[PDB]
Structure formats: C-alpha cells, structure tokens
Design a protein around this nucleic acid. Structure first.
Ligand SMILES: [Mg+2]
Ligand SMILES: [Mg+2]
Ligand SMILES: [Mg+2]
Ligand SMILES: [Mg+2]
Ligand SMILES: [Mg+2]
Ligand SMILES: [Mg+2]
Ligand SMILES: [Mg+2]
Ligand SMILES: [Mg+2]
Ligand SMILES: [Mg+2]
Ligand SMILES: [Mg+2]
Ligand SMILES: [Mg+2]
Ligand SMILES: [Mg+2]
Ligand SMILES: [Mg+2]
Ligand SMILES: [Mg+2]
Ligand SMILES: [Zn+2]
Lengths: 151, 107, 173, 129, 125, 242, 146
RNA sequence: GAGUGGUGGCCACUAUUAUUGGGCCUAAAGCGGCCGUAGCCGGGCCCGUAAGUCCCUGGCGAAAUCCCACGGCUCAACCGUGGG
RNA sequence: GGUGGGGUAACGGCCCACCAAGCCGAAGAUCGGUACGGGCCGUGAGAGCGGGAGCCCGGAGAUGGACACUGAGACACGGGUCC
C-alpha cells in the first residue's frame, strides 16, 4: 500500500516479456546513444528522456540492447550518460524531493498557521532521510553529506 | 619465527618486553577471534565476540556478546573496527589477560 | 539436594468411590481370598509395568532396544505367563487374572494340596509347604514355571503322612 | 509486505482444495517451491505441474486431484537430528505413518522417510497429509 | 597489616563485601629501604614452605661489570637519581634501576637488594 | 582440607578402577605417595586381602606383609599402603606364583598369571628426558623412576619409546622404538585394553595432544591419544598379554 | 489482533521478557514471591498456636440463618496478638473458663480463611489445658485441675 | 484397615501464564491519531565461503541415586556382577 | 590504562612515585531484597512448575570485632593477645 496514506492504487505499466528487440525497430545502438546524449544536453531529466524516446521515436525501453562493452549487463539511460560524463551528481529522486521541500519552506514563512501543509513537509523530509540512508550505505554519497534545510 | 599458531608474523620489530613476537611473553591456552570496539588507553584494546545461546523452554535462540580487554603491542597497533586474533597469557593487569597476535582484516 | 527415599511399590485409585470399579474389585477379592485391597493393587501395578515396557519398546530402534526386548520376553515366559513361542505383541493382551493365577496360594489350591483357598493360605503360613526343597511362608510369592512341579508337603510336617486325619479329608475331595 | 513465498503457496493450495478447484497458479515461483512440488508429486498428492515464464519471477501451474487433507509450512524452521523424527510426527501428523514431513538437508529436499533411511537430519520446512 | 589478597572494587566501580577472613599466606612485609652506609647489614627471613630470603638493609660495596665481562668490587659514594620515587635520591635509597656513583664512574643497578642481598650494577658510558 | 592435607578416604569417593564393595563399610585405605598415580594403582592391602584372599582381616594381612612374603619388582614391600600399578610384577616365592597387573576391558585392575622366566623383565615407557650435571642424560619413566645414560648414547632414546628393564638389578636389555608397525597396548580411555599395530600419527597446533591410529587383528582401525599407547614389541609382543 | 508475537527464530529474549512481564498479573504468583502472607500472618506460618483465653463472646450467624455461635478471645503467647477462635461441638463452651490455655488451628475455609455462616472467625479450639476438646464433648475424659 | 481422621505448605486439577497451547465488537483487555531510532521479520536468479545447522570419530562431564537381566540373604525391601 | 619500583612461594593497582583520561551502563550499570553452590529430590502424559536439612563433592565459622607466635601446612573449635 501507500507509505503514509495506506491506499492501494494499482495503476502502472504492463510490460510484455520479450528478449530481443522487435523486428520493426530499425535504430542501431549508435543512433540511440546519440539521441540520448542530444536529449540530455537539451536539459531533460532521465525519466523524461525515456518518455520522449517511446512517444516520438517508437523505441520501447533501451533495456532491450546488450551493453556493447560489458556483455554481462543490459543498457540503461543512466549507464549511457555515465559513459559520456553527463550523469547526475546527486540521484534524481533525492534531488526532486529536496527541490519540493525548499519551495514549501518559503510558503510556510508567510503562512505560519497552515498546519495541514506542514504535515506534508514532515512526510517529505522523512522520505528524504530514508533515501539518504540508503545512498550512504551503497556509497553513492559521501560519508559527510548531510541534509540541513538552512543550507 | 613461529610461536605455535602457524600464522605470519608482523612486518617490523619492536622493543616491548610484553610482545610475544619480539619479547619474553609466552602464550598458552585459548585463541579467540573478534572485532575491536575501543582503543583509547595506551596499548589496550577492547574486543567483542558474538554468539548464540539456545533457550530450551522456548526452543529459540538469543544473541549474546563477550567483551575482552587485550594488550596491544606497538608492532601491530590495531585500530577501531578491524578483525583481530587474540591469545591467552599470564595476568598483565587487573583486567588484561590476552594479547593481540595478528590483524586479519584491516578496517 | 536430597538423599534417596524409598517409595511405595503400588498405586492407589484416582477416585475412591466409583461403583463399577468397586464391584469388579470385590469379585476378584472374594474369588482369590486376598487380605486387603493393597495386596490386589500390588499385583495390578506389576501388570501395568510390563505393559509400559512393551509400549516403549515397540517404538524404539537401535542395539540396546533389541537386547531389552528379548530380555522382556524371556522374563515373561520364565514366569509362566506366556507360551514359549509368543511375540512382543502378545504382551499387550495380558490380564490381571493371569498374574493372580501364579500366586503360591492359588497354585497350592489347584494342585490339590488343600480343599479351599483359605486352607491353602494357612497351610503356607504355618510352614507345611515346601518349594524346591525350601520352605516359603509368603502366600503372595510368584511361582516360576521351572519349579512348579516340585511343590509338596514339607518332609517334617504332620501332613507328610498319608494317615493323618486332616490330610485324608483333603484327599476326599 | 511479502515475507515468505512458500507459506503462501501451501495456504493457497489448502484453501483451493476445500472448494474443489482443479488447478491453481502459484504466482511467485522459486527453486524451493519447485522442490516441494516434486516431492509432493512423487507421493501422489498432486498431478502434473509446469513452469511458465513472464519477465518476473515466473509462475507455477498445478493440477489438483482432491487427495489432500491439509498442507502447511513450518515456521520457524526447526533443526532436527537423525533420530528425533517421532516427536515431530506426533506434533504434526495424525497416525504413525500418515503423511510426510518435508526436510531440507545438505543432500537436498526430501521427505522425512527418505532422510531417516539415509540416517541424516536437517531442517523442517513443511508438512502434508 | 599488609594484605595482598584482592581489591575491594569491581571494574565497573561497585563495592565488594568480604566473604571470609584474611588467610595467612596472603600477607606482605615492610619494604626494606636499602641505604648507603659505612658498614653493610643484612638479615634472614624464614618464608613460606620454610625457605629463606636475605634482606639487605645497609649497603657499602657494589659489584660493577663492564661490557667485556670482568667485574670489580668497589665502594658506593651516593645515589645520583632514582626514577622509582621522587625523593629516593635525597635519602640515599637504593633500588633496582637507580643510578649510583662509585670511585670508578656511574653505574646502574641490575639486582633487587631486598630480595637478593647484594648490589650489582653495570657501568655507564 | 581447610588448613592442611587430607589423610582419610571414604569408600564412596574411592577411585573407580578398584574392585571393592562401596557400601559395605565407611572408610577405605588412602594410599601413600609412591610410584604410579591414584588413577592407575591400588594399595597392596587390597591385593593381599580382597583379590588373592590369603587373609580374612587387615590385622592378619599386616602380619603376612611384615614377614617379607611379597615382592613387587623383586623388592620386599612391607607397607600396606604401598601402591601397585600398571605393568608391575607381583611375586610370592613361597608359593611360587607370579602375576602382572593390567587394566581390564572396562578399565579395572586385574592380576594376570605369567611364567617365571618372563617375571624378571618390566617394560617402562619413556615419559621425559633431560640434561643433568656433568652433562649426563636422565630418563624419567612412566612409573616415576629414573635412569642415567652417557652423552654418547643420547640418540638411542626418545620420549614414547619403551625400555625393557631387568629387575631388581635395573639393567637395560632392550629398546623398542615408537614408529609405524610397532605393536601397542592401550592403557586408558574408551579403547582401553585393545591392542594392535601403529598406522599413522597426527599433530596439532598450540599444545593440543597428538593422536595415533591403530589396526587390530581383525582389520579394524581405531584412534587414541599418543600417550595412551604403550609399545610392547616390534611386530609381536615381548610379554604375555590377555 | 494479528498473529501472536514474537514467533521469530532469533527472538528468544523478547519472548522470555514478555512471559516474565505478564506473570506478575497472576495473584497466586505475586503473593508467594513477595511473601505477602508471611508479613501479616498472626500465626507466623505455623500450623497451630498456643494462647490464653481472655473472654467469651457470641457471634450472630449470617442471613438468612439464625443463631448464635460460641467463641473466645485468645491472646497468643508467641507474639502477644489477639484473635478470635470458635468452639465446636454441642455445649462445648462449658468446658472453657477464663484464664485457660488453649491450642488453636485454622478453621478450613476457602483460601485458608473463614467458612460457612461465620465470617470473621478464622480459627477453632483443639485442646484445653492439654486435653482434647472432642473427648470432653463426647465424654471419655474429664477436665483436669477441676 | 494396624491404621484412620484434623490443620498448614508445594505440584496436579488449570489451555486460570498458554514455546507446544489462551484471549482483546457487545463479557477483563487495541495507546485519541500519526511519524520515526535500536530490536525482531524481510522478494527472484548465479558464483564463492563455511559461522549457524547435519553426519562420522578422539578427550571429558566422580561415586551414590534411575531402568533392565542374572546371582546372595526364605522370596522381597536391601546388597553384588554386567548392559544402558 | 601506561612507565619505574616494592612486596610475595608466585603473576597482578596487591601497594607506592610519576604521566594521562579512561572504565561500566536500558542487551539494566549502581543500589536494595532474599539466599551457602552442585550431584540430586517432590510432582506431572509430556512440555513444564516447585525445593535444595540428613548421604557424597566444594565453601565458610568456632560469643561479636581485630591481631600474632610455632610449623612442611594455621592467623589454629578441646593453643596465645587486646577491646
Ligand atoms: Mg544442600
Ligand atoms: Mg580442622
Ligand atoms: Mg483450583
Ligand atoms: Mg480465557
Ligand atoms: Mg485506537
Ligand atoms: Mg479506545
Ligand atoms: Mg512507524
Ligand atoms: Mg529470500
Ligand atoms: Mg559450521
Ligand atoms: Mg555418576
Ligand atoms: Mg535363596
Ligand atoms: Mg530376585
Ligand atoms: Mg548396588
Ligand atoms: Mg539456591
Ligand atoms: Zn613486537
């Protein structure tokens, strides 16, 4: 169920089980990596790039091509960006939550009696702390990195 | 040199008379393995070992920990967080009866 | 802790006043002429012990279990309670009457030494009966099969004379 | 959350056989569930079963025959020595050779009769009768 | 008087209530503060198991050894310093490890006079 | 023992290797210090009175001993507290009978009859070896007695070897090395009183004792401690064993 | 309420703590371990006691019964406390006189307390001047020292 | 039945302490609500390790006490020789 | 806890001189209550619950509190000194 509201929505994607890319897809791996780099340099987020690739170029997920360099693994958008040095420094979902929290902290300065919007702030910060604990454990963040709202 | 454990000695030498590798200290008895949890006093460390105890009535296990104070020679000089091997000796102070004889995995 | 204390060798009923149990026990007491209930209870306990040993060994396996199994069978058929070809299962079909038939009193009555159970009891207690050349004065002694046929009047007894008046009356029946 | 795939499978089977279902789908598959199904099939408690691949963990399709009184998992997974099977039988089964306990040993998953024959112990994980 | 049995404190800091009397085999004795004097003086102590210890109370001579292995019996002048106690040097107390001055140079004591009854020292350079 | 040594011994606390009735009386004989240890020896009084049966009471048993009727390793023993132990020899010359003391298959001590020719030798296991003043070698045996040898012979003797000694003169007449193929007899443990040949030797770190493997007559292998294995011959026993 | 907890394999400590915690809700266990009966028992844990009679009284029965029950006040020799003791038997109160010494014991009601229609009385008289009271009530014996 | 009753204590009765194995809508019992630190419980596959776990074997856990057969006191209670 | 000593039959903060700031604790320290420990014993289908005088093995005491002589061994129940 939902983490805080305990609702039970079920909507999501229903991906068919396939191994090989479809026959009608004509792009090679070089074309797809060029497209991903170009879209990233236009400034889109990682989740948005895949949406554009699916909608406009007819490419179901890039997780259908084997990594040309490492045969053990398949290809993903963040891996493609890592191969060129355009990958984000902070993981994206943590960054989005931090951005949402900062905007809400300036709303609460002019509206100190808005107590219902403040619980939302507390829940957002709980999510942030869970994420930073996970990323510290895996080494994606330095040992000293800390979330301080006054920063 | 070998002192009976069949493990590799430390790289450099020391001048501690209480060092089994380079001094007059003799080891005999138990040999335990553990993790350092304190190194504040001079030449003394605290080593923790964890084990399981069987509760017969409830047919389940519980976790217990044993903490031992050990003499730390300057040739080895263990720090907080690494795996060490300790051996039993004659009394050395009020609470010290073991000596560190090897660091197996530096922190 | 505590040192050893000697324990009773019989067990008492869980409820003292149960009508059916009282009827059954009265029938047995009158037929075999026992002095008190505890005597009867003694024999009952013996039976239960045998049964408890058979139930435990049917469910066991290993080397000691087989030794104890053959020891139980040998002891049971030495006392005359089982035929010489019986198996462990036949232990569970024994009854209380089988044990009461092995008392020295009952055997003296059945061999024709005495006319009655009570007379047999007295004959034993006063010392007129010998078993394998030795005088025994306990009416509850359990007789081994191997010695059953050497049971006679004691060679010093008044009754060891075919002309004694009381012996003749016993022969008369 | 989901904590134990094997308990779900056995409770699902025992729920479905009480209303006369003829087949079931075990949704999270695993190798251990496959072993338990093989042992159950060898003794005639179920029919044929097969593995179906989605892009996820996979599914098992099982045929029922109406021959199960009850089936369940054992938690925690108690260790048992090679000569202590009788008391677990009395705890879980209805008569002296009625049904099986399923044991994980360092030679594989097997019924407690085979394990007792080989003379080894292991871990109790399920019972079926 | 001088009991060397055990401490009445646990390593956590709590107190211990004594559960028996002091046994005789646990007692110590008065320290011998071996001084420098004109004439030497020693006594004999009967010890556990009926053994003996020679206790030196006043020292006037010493044995000095060089690195070559030869030794000389000379007389003691004074105690230059003694790292064991801050005021041993002023009172001329000799213990193992003290630095003494002789007629052939300074020397460092290597024996225990209260346990052995002689003063042995190695020559300093 | 609040203030000093014990001098008494209750029957119920007696060593488990004696043949004795533990509930018949209260006290038992506390053995004197001597050759063997408490676990592998028994006082002489029980040998005279309980085992062989030459006396009914302790008082007349002491009269036999004080007249010089019993020899242990060829020497007169008069003390009724004197311990008699494994591989010792008991001789009664007046009746002309000899015995060897041996452990049983359950660990208790028994007397085994032997011939007069074999009664003059005693096997002694080498328990330790050291240097003594004058640069001589002292050998310390399994029963506590000692022997001296010159520095020239120092390489013929090692611990666990067996020396065949002639008694009472105490003169060496044989050395039996401990090695593969040697014939051994077990004196303690679960495998006590079994015998056979040596097959393997194994060693361990940090002062744990070493273990040996033995093959018996029928072809079965069993293990024991090295110090529980007594060497008795090269490929056949040199003494009579049950 | 969900499944009983904890059931985990490595959760023995919490399980033992839970059982220990809720055992104190058992009144039988709490009174034995804290020794609550010993602290208030005028007999000091004895099965019988010896005392001196101070006066005779009569106690009314509980409703709906009617009648008067004959009792005495007793001062205990061991600690000086005063209790009330019932005198069983028909006409038994005649054999008691002031300044007599008696042996008393429990009366045998539920939970070691009172019984029947006489609450408040926990003991009964067994001997008078070292002679059994049952004998005196039946006959077969006469009270000494007149 | 040479015993048979009275008082007080512990176990059983009692699944009224519940691991085996109890309860919490209306009968005693779900914190007024939520967030979260230690602890407990944790999805699928492949490779390694061998701490837990399982099997085999050496050295120990005194005697008395417990169970079984056989033997000595008339049988037994008791005591001895062996196996557990 | 470290360094240097003393003392002891012997290792040791056992005790001193100097140098540091360590050591234990909600997985219950510290303090209070009650109690000599065990082999064993009572009860129960078992899982358990309760007890630990008598026989054996270990500890402690000799009116309460301190302290010495002799001896291989005692700070000694039928040996000594003080309150
Ligand atoms: Mg006791
Ligand atoms: Mg004494
Ligand atoms: Mg009740
Ligand atoms: Mg209820
Ligand atoms: Mg609520
Ligand atoms: Mg409420
Ligand atoms: Mg929460
Ligand atoms: Mg898993
Ligand atoms: Mg392991
Ligand atoms: Mg025993
Ligand atoms: Mg007889
Ligand atoms: Mg018999
Ligand atoms: Mg016996
Ligand atoms: Mg206790
Ligand atoms: Zn070193």
């Amino acid at each position: 169920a939902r983490m805080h509201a305990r609702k039970r929505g079920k909507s999501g994607s229903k991906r068919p089980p396939r191994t090989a890319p479809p026959i009608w897809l004509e792009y090679t791996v070089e074309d797809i990596e060029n497209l991903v780099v170009k879209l990233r340099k236009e400034g889109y987020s990682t989740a948005m790039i895949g949406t554009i690739l699916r909608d406009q170029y007819g490419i179901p997920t890039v997780k259908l091509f084997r990594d040309p360099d490492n045969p053990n693994r398949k290809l993903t958008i963040t891996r493609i960006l890592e191969k060129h040095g355009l990958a984000p420094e902070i993981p994206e979902d943590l960054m989005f939550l931090i951005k949402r929290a900062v905007n809400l902290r300036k709303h609460l300065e002019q509206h100190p009696k808005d107590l219902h919007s403040m619980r939302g702030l507390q829940l957002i910060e709980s999510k942030i702390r869970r994420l930073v604990k996970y990323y510290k454990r895996k080494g994606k963040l330095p040992k000293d990195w800390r979330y301080d709202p006054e920063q | 040199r070998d002192i009976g454990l069949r493990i590799q000695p430390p790289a450099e030498k020391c001048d501690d008379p209480k060092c089994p590798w380079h001094g007059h200290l003799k080891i005999h008895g138990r040999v335990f393995e553990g993790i350092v949890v304190s190194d504040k006093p001079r030449k003394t460390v605290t080593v923790e070992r964890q084990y399981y105890h069987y509760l017969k009535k409830y047919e389940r296990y519980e976790l217990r920990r044993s903490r031992i104070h050990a003499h730390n020679p300057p040739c080895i000089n263990a720090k907080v967080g690494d795996r060490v091997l300790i051996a039993e000796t004659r009394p050395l102070s009020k609470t010290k009866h073991f000596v560190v004889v090897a660091v197996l995995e530096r922190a | 802790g505590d040192p050893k204390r000697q324990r009773k060798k019989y067990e008492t009923p869980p409820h003292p006043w149960i009508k059916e149990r009282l009827d059954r026990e009265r029938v047995l007491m009158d037929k075999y002429e026992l002095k008190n209930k505890k005597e009867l209870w003694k024999h009952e306990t013996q039976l239960k012990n045998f049964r408890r040993r058979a139930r435990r060994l049917l469910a066991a396996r290993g080397k000691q279990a087989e030794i104890e199994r053959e020891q139980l069978l040998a002891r049971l058929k030495r006392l005359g309670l089982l035929p010489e070809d019986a198996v462990l299962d036949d232990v569970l079909s024994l009854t209380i009457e089988d044990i009461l038939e092995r008392r020295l009193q009952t055997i003296v009555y059945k061999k024709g030494l005495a006319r009655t159970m009570r007379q047999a009891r007295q004959l034993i207690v006063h010392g007129h009966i010998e078993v394998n050349g030795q005088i025994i004065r306990s009416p509850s002694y359990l007789v081994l099969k191997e010695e059953e046929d050497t049971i006679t009047y004691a060679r010093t007894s008044p009754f060891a004379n075919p002309q004694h008046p009381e012996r003749m009356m016993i022969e008369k029946a | 959350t989901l904590l134990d795939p094997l308990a779900n499978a056995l409770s699902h089977i025992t729920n479905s056989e009480r209303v006369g279902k003829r087949e079931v789908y075990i949704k999270p598959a695993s190798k251990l569930i496959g072993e338990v199904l093989r042992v159950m099939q060898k003794y005639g408690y179920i029919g044929e079963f097969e593995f179906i691949d989605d892009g996820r963990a996979g599914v098992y399709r099982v045929q029922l025959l109406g021959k199960i009184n009850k089936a369940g998992a054992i938690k925690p997974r108690f260790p048992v020595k090679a000569r202590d099977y009788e008391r677990w039988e009395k705890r879980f089964l209805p008569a002296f050779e009625f049904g099986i306990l399923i044991v994980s040993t360092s030679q594989g998953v097997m019924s407690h009769k085979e394990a007792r024959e080989k003379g080894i112990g292991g871990r109790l994980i399920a019972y079926v009768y | 008087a001088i009991w060397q049995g055990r401490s009445l404190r646990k390593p956590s800091g709590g107190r211990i209530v004594l559960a028996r009397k002091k046994r005789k085999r646990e007692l110590g004795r008065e320290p011998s503060n071996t001084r420098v004097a004109e004439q030497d003086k020693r006594k004999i102590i009967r010890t556990y198991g009926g053994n003996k210890k020679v206790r030196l109370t006043a020292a006037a001579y010493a044995n000095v050894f060089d690195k070559s292995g030869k030794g000389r019996k000379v007389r003691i002048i004074r105690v230059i310093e003694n790292p064991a106690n801050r005021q041993f040097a002023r009172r001329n107390i000799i213990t193992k490890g003290a630095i003494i001055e002789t007629e052939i140079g300074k020397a460092k004591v290597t024996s225990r006079p209260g346990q052995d009854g002689v003063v042995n020292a190695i020559l300093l350079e | 023992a609040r203030k000093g040594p014990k001098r008494h011994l209750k029957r119920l606390a007696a060593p488990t290797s004696w043949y004795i009735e533990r509930k018949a009386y209260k006290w038992a004989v506390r053995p004197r210090p001597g050759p063997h240890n408490m676990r592998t020896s028994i006082p002489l009084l029980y040998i005279v009175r309980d085992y062989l049966g030459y006396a009914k009471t302790a008082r007349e048993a002491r009269k036999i001993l004080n007249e010089g009727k019993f020899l242990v390793d060829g020497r007169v023993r008069k003390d009724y507290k004197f311990p008699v132990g494994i591989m010792d020899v008991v001789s009664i010359p007046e009746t002309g009978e000899h015995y060897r003391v041996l452990p049983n298959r359950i660990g208790k001590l028994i007397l085994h009859p032997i011939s007069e020719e074999e009664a003059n030798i005693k096997p002694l296991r080498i328990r330790n070896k050291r240097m003594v003043k004058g640069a001589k070698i002292q050998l310390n045996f399994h029963d506590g007695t000692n022997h001296l040898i010159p520095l020239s012979e120092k390489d013929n003797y090692f611990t666990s070897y067996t020396v065949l000694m002639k008694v009472p003169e105490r003169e060496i007449l044989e050395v039996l090395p401990f090695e593969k193929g040697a014939y051994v007899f077990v004196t303690q443990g679960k495998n006590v009183a079994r015998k056979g040949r040596i097959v393997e030797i194994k060693k361990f770190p940090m002062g744990w004792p070493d273990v040996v493997t033995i093959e018996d007559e029928e072809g079965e292998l069993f293990d024991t401690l090295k110090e529980y294995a007594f060497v008795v011959g090269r490929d056949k026993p040199r003494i009579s064993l049950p | 309420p969900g499944k009983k907890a904890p059931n985990g394999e490595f959760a023995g400590r919490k399980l033992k703590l839970k059982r220990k915690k809720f055992r104190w809700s058992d009144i039988r266990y709490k009174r034995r371990v804290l020794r609550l009966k010993e602290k208030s028992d005028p007999l000091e844990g004895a099965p019988q006691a010896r005392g001196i009679v101070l006066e005779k009284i009569a106690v009314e029965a509980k409703q709906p019964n009617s009648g008067m029950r004959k009792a005495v006040r007793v001062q205990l020799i061991k600690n000086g406390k005063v209790v009330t003791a019932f005198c069983p038997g028909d006409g038994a109160i005649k054999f008691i006189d002031e300044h007599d010494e008696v042996i008393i014991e429990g009366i045998g009601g539920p939970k070691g307390g009172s019984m029947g229609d006489i609450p408040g009385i926990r003991y009964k008289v067994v001997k008078v001047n070292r002679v059994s009271l049952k004998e005196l009530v039946k006959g077969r014996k006469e009270k000494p020292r007149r």
